[PDB]
């Protein structure tokens, strides 16, 4: 059971993005697409760094997007986290 | 003389390279025959002699011939390895060092960490004129010169790579031509590249399979002085039969976990020995006579050895081997001691080993 | 950040690509420090946000303890967790990680012999074998192989490999002796 | 043929009880676990025999004095004076023993080969009794799975 | 086998609706779509 749990963890990580949850097959239409998406666009490390930067930043110096995310984080609303959508999926027509 | 020596050396090399594997199987078959013969020794009397006794009377000369044949086949297997598998190792090493030199600058930008024997030994081959001897890309030095000649200096790059500067320009320019036969002995002994062959022999010596075959040869030689050394060649079934690899992979898949399980068992048994040495010393007499007591837990080391050797191998634990606790003021404590020893050591840890093997299979 | 935003929002502009090659150096320098995430913006659209990642933050992130904590968090979320609470658990883990990363930065304020012995053994033992070639004394061998004999040729062929094997045995013995000398 | 031989000797009718394997499909599920990895099981027995032969070689070369199996002092029943006898003793007794060959060969205490023989017995118990039998168990379980 | 059966049960429940049988991927185009569908529209408790 422990081995199966570890295998399931690695399979989930390698098959779907942690943030949006979209499968790797969709991103793999572009070569190295899943790696690019999980390391450049939807990186959980990048989200943690953004939370750190937003907390350390002064509230008066916040931009519009930073203020929006800050307000929703104070109210504990996680709708700003992309779920089922991404930049590529939104701009399919324009990008490619 | 020259064509004959080169051609006949190449012929023998090709023959041994072709027949390397068949000779490796023949060595195993001869080892099984020798050990089957060895299964019929008797010790004869003091003076201790190990004499080969047989009703037929033919099996001792047969054993001697088989031992000589096994030694010859082991030497031939070493030769066949050197002819066949060594070139692949040299090609891989030459390709790897070239790739690291070009795309990483392993000896220009960085340096080996001084603890990598391979990286430190690969310094010699760089300056040699016989580089990519086996690897195809013979322009690797020129590629390195083009890549790193500006930042690090053309002269320094040439010194590192063992490349000339003015000889090529002079040969392009004014020159004189005079035919010369290469068959002069000084010419051939200079044409052989000492440094590159030294590096090649170092790689061959550090190769694992060559070391295994050298150990095989050494054991075969020792078998003549003592015939029972031929039993070590029966360990070659693991490395010669792929079928046994499936069975042995179950053991080797979780070998680290198996070793850690033995370490944990030793620690647990040491804790039990500490408890027994502190509280249950009177229950470790192992002498049937009342005159002399053979107390097994008066010494800490003796008690630990007693535990590890006897209690673990015992079916019911240490309580199967240390006497009855009935009618004593520590009876309940010792009952708990024995039951916990049986449950944790005999039942659980052995179950851990079993499960490790089964999980490796799965 | 301006150039990256422009390039990513317009991937097919050659005039901007020229400026990208023009600013390759600055973009390469600021590549580690440039953060990039995607959010559901206020306009009901996915928006891309660019921020600054600090060197201290990145180093504290690739500290091994934080990596082990990340692996444990991912394992726990994947095995025991629901998608409805995933983004709450992730924010809690991010907060705890940020606190420990800041505390670590706060508190952080201002064998070789065995390898060399083996290499020396290789060098010495190989030079012992090459000394026969360096002696240039094989004139006697040439004089005795004036007579072209298959037996002599095979004998020399076997003798070379036997010498190589003996040299390997000497090398192994030297390595073992050096190991005992070092450990002693 | 077995049924005919049963008339001359009635105990030949017991061979017909081997027909349950070929007549009952329920027993096939149990027996397939054995037969699924039969080659691996045979190779495991061969490996066990080779390992026990190596142990017998070591015992015959170094631990001959520990193989007396006679309680009387008048006549010694030495079980490892002959190589074949020692190998038979190992394969027959030590493998079936719960703790290995050391359960059946006498105490090594107070001897100059005591530590070597302790290592010998412990390694025999670990490799033969524990590991190889575990290999057979795991083969059967893996066949089921 | 018992563990595998339990895992299969939970996997089926989490991947497809009990009533319609449509996979969760189709409903997940809208965020929390599968949860909304299985708790508001096709609830077996609601059918009972
Ligand atoms: N949002 C995400 N952020 C990061 N990785 C993701 C994400 N979604 C899926 N992944 C997958 O997780 C992988 C990285 O996970 P992980 O942390 O285990 O990396 P690793 O290469 O095993 O080592 P390390 O522990 O050093 O990061 C990515 O390569 C990708 O396949
Ligand atoms: N038609 C359906 N009705 C209800 N749940 C469904 C349906 N189809 C699929 N499901 C899945 O089953 C889950 C609910 O099943 P279950 O009864 O096991 O809930 P639980 O959260 O484990 O606890 P509880 O036993 O208290 O209800 C839903 O969250 C959903 O993922
Ligand atoms: Zn994503
Ligand atoms: Zn439904």
UniProtKB/Swiss-Prot annotation, chain A:
It comes from Homo sapiens. The lineage of its organism: Eukaryota, Metazoa, Chordata, Craniata, Vertebrata. It is found in: Sarcoplasmic reticulum membrane. The gene is RYR2. It comes from the Eukaryota. Homotetramer. Can also form heterotetramers with RYR1 and RYR3. Interacts with FKBP1A and FKBP1B; these interactions may stabilize the channel in its closed state and prevent Ca(2+) leaks. Interacts with CALM and S100A1; these interactions regulate channel activity. Identified in a complex composed of RYR2, FKBP1B, PKA catalytic subunit, PRKAR2A, AKAP6, and the protein phosphatases PP2A and PP1. Interacts directly with FKBP1B, PKA, PP1 and PP2A. Interacts with SELENON. In cardiac muscles, identified in a complex, composed of FSD2, CMYA5 and RYR2. Induction: By TGFB1. It is linked to Ventricular tachycardia, catecholaminergic polymorphic, 1, with or without atrial dysfunction and/or dilated cardiomyopathy: An arrhythmogenic disorder characterized by stress-induced, bidirectional ventricular tachycardia that may degenerate into cardiac arrest and cause sudden death. Patients present with recurrent syncope, seizures, or sudden death after physical activity or emotional stress. CPVT1 inheritance is autosomal dominant. Ventricular arrhythmias due to cardiac ryanodine receptor calcium release deficiency syndrome: An autosomal dominant arrhythmogenic disorder characterized by syncope, cardiac arrest and/or sudden unexpected death, often in association with physical exertion or acute emotional stress. Patients who survive manifest polymorphic ventricular tachycardia and ventricular fibrillation. Unlike typical catecholaminergic ventricular tachycardia, arrhythmias are not reproducible on exercise stress testing or adrenaline challenge. Cytosolic calcium-activated calcium channel that mediates the release of Ca(2+) from the sarcoplasmic reticulum into the cytosol and thereby plays a key role in triggering cardiac muscle contraction. Aberrant channel activation can lead to cardiac arrhythmia. In cardiac myocytes, calcium release is triggered by increased Ca(2+) cytosolic levels due to activation of the L-type calcium channel CACNA1C. The calcium channel activity is modulated by formation of heterotetramers with RYR3. Required for cellular calcium ion homeostasis. Required for embryonic heart development. Channel activity is modulated by phosphorylation. Phosphorylation is increased in failing heart, leading to calcium leaks and increased cytoplasmic Ca(2+) levels. Changing residue 8 to H: Decreased function in release of sequestered calcium ion into cytosol by sarcoplasmic reticulum. Changed ryanodine-sensitive calcium-release channel activity. Detected in heart muscle (at protein level). Heart muscle, brain (cerebellum and hippocampus) and placenta. Belongs to the ryanodine receptor (TC 1.A.3.1) family. RYR2 subfamily. The calcium release channel activity resides in the C-terminal region while the remaining part of the protein resides in the cytoplasm. Residues 1-96 are cytoplasmic. This is Ryanodine receptor 2.
